[PDB]
């Protein structure tokens, strides 16, 4: 009997007398009882692993009681249910093809949740053919769900979206399901870009907390090399890659560039005129001065939106000044997201070298520098301040270099910068 | 709570009014095709994004001009500039810890799939010699 | 303390008349569709969208605190909501953290107990 199996010795030596008993809730649910970790492991061997095997059942069931809230603690039993069920591919799909539409969701959104962040990570479709269709009509359906009136969001939508990120990352690092990994990644992106959760007022980052993972994800997958799927399948596309470079998390950005100067190595050898090398230097091409050398009117389509809408737009924004406007706030000095992280960048850089003049304000700016740099001349023109400084584009590449020391989260910026401004490439 | 309050009040009534804006927005650009066109509403997927980054990006600007009209000469006396710097620091504090825990999930799930490969290779083997029974 | 209280009045005049806004357009709007009602007209629009994205609606007045409402909320917001994903991320990494060792004692004791029953194959591969 396998209670009376006390040791690992005592499993090898009696194991085909072994008798494999009945009792599943207790085999399952948490000396005599040293090996109970081994107990459903085992009885899955005992016997091949078929469908009707006690403990796939036994666990389908009590996930399905957990569903239906009858359940005295539903916290209690999940690991559990994940633990076996996340190292089995077999009972794992069972799960998923029974708890993986729209109608299991209605009844707990948070239990499904915690299953899908079990479940979800580790997983093989059996068959690669009936389940693209299949998330991605969850994961629509998920979405429906998440956003409709009454009740604004609750991460319920952006954090089931990593967990099939996760996923993802499980099957592109295996073979012969990547194309099940980036054709169904393309389609959560355009999912996650939309703007009733990827907004630019309330955005609620969790779309774009979740979306850097997934745009990390296939950047992982730039990064290694020595593997064959279209790029086709890793060029985000500027229908929603516009979409980010205009938001205004600054990580957001960050995680962007990073994913962008993580294609250049494995870009360029494409050829030049290339149906998607196109869009990829378009982003090049301007988000190279949404942060820097902004010549946004002198160019056109910023964003692909048009430039004169700012010409129209700059007007009847009303500025105490009008010194400089056009070029005002166009950059690092100047953008929303990453302006007020600059001035601390210069403030904790000022409080290194002990400075005595103590930038007054906080703004960096074309025409603040101007005046804290006039008013306070022959002084600082003897000493007390950052060294190199004679113009403001010095005060932006030591922003840059000082940006560009892992300890903020914001670092791929700089590495951008250096690597795709050609100006400023000598660091 | 007074000036708590007050605050909260601000909240509830500016998210009202960047709702109501961003519709407005919204409502304006349909208007626009609306009476241009006749009834030309089939804004397609790829036309709906490309008025939403519009959309966005002006909010964008008219959110960087605030930017220069609280800060250049800090009043410190402002009871709303004194609301942007600790809403502005507040900001960017957590900043480390995603980074970090992001890449502290992007290894610990390398170490669940590993150990999990090896236990399929484990049990494949295991049933292969409990078949050679 | 007067100043943001003057500050709600103002925004509620700025919400008010945004409202008003909302509701003329929409009445345009629906009265353009009701006269053109012969039937679900959606055609293609023809290079005017272009002419359209050259330009905005709804210039600002400059007394309209709007582009603070764009920045107070989007950044309190973009702060009350990183603490709970953190929450969730450490409270998920903790979870997976203790679970892979669950897994791995386990699928040690597996391992060893392959080489048990194996050896024992053999050695009652003998009779």
Redesign the interface.
Known sequence: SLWDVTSLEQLAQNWPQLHIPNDVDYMMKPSRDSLKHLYSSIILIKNSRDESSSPYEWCIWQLKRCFAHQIETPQEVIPIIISVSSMDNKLSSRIIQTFCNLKYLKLDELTLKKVCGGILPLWKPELISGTREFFVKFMASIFMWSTRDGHDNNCTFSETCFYVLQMITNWVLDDKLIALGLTLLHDMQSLLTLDKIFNNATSNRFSTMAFISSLDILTQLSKQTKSDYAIQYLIVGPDIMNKVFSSDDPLLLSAACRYLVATKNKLMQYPSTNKFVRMQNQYIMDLTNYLYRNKVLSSKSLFGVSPDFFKQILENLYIPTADFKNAKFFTITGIPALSYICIIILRRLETAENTKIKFTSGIINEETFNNFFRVHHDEIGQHGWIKGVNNIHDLRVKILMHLSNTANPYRDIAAFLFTYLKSLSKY | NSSEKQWERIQQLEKEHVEVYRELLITLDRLYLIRKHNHAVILSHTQQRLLEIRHQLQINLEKTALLIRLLEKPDNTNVLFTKLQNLLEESNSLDYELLQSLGAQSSLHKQLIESRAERDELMSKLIELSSKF | ?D???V??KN??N??GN??Y??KQ??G??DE??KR?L?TE?????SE???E?????????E?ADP??????????????Q??????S???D??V???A??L??????S??????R???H??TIMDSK
Do not use: C, H
Not at chain 3, 41 to 45: D, Q, T
Not at chain 3, 102 to 107: A, D, F, P, T, W
Not at chain 3, 109 to 114: A, G, M, Q, T
């Open positions: 303390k100043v943001l209280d500050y709600i925004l509620e700025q919400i945004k409202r806004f909302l357009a929409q345009a709007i353009i569709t053109s012969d007209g959606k055609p293609v629009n005017v969208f272009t359209l994205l050259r330009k905005p609606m709804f210039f600002s400059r709007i582009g603070f409402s764009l920045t107070s909320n989007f950044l309190s917001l973009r702060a909501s990183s603490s709970e994903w953190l969730l991320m450490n998920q990494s979870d997976q953290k679970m892979l669950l897994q791995n004692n386990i699928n004791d597996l391992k060893e107990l392959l048990k029953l194996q024992q194959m």
